């Protein structure tokens, strides 16, 4: 069916005690260092509790792209789940977060899915 394309990101290695309020807050923060020409509109945030995993449907595509750029450039690691700065800690046993754009048949599934 349809959908507008290149709207979400899969966020990957965050604290699995964390929450959707603290996933906004790092995702502004990290956001804000990447531009201010456009705000921060991460429009859903779905996360389910004592996941590594979210996934965000973005506000348009720009955003989409704007925080997979973020990730990319910025070393950013969740030390604990209220965390928002996530500032990477030597000797840290915690991974990168990482954004990356779902596509195909993943995306056509999320949409599949929120409309079943």
């Not at 807050?25 to 990290?30: A, I, K, P, R, W």
């Not at 509109?41 to 779905?46: F, L, S, V």
């Not at 997979?68 to 046993?93: C, L, M, P, V």
Request: net charge positive.
């Amino acid at each position: 069916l349809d959908f507008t394309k290149n709207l979400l990101t899969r966020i990957k290695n965050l604290h699995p005690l964390t929450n959707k309020s603290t996933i906004h807050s790092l995702l502004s923060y990290v956001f804000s260092r990447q531009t201010q020409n456009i705000a921060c509109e991460p429009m859903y945030i779905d996360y389910r509790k004592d996941e590594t995993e979210a996934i965000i449907r973005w506000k348009t595509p720009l955003h989409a792209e704007t925080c997979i750029n973020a990730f990319r450039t910025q070393e950013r690691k969740q030390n604990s789940h209220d965390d928002i700065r996530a500032h990477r800690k030597k000797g840290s046993s915690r991974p990168f977060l990482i954004a990356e754009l779902i596509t195909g048949e993943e995306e056509k599934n999320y949409w599949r899915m929120l409309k079943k």
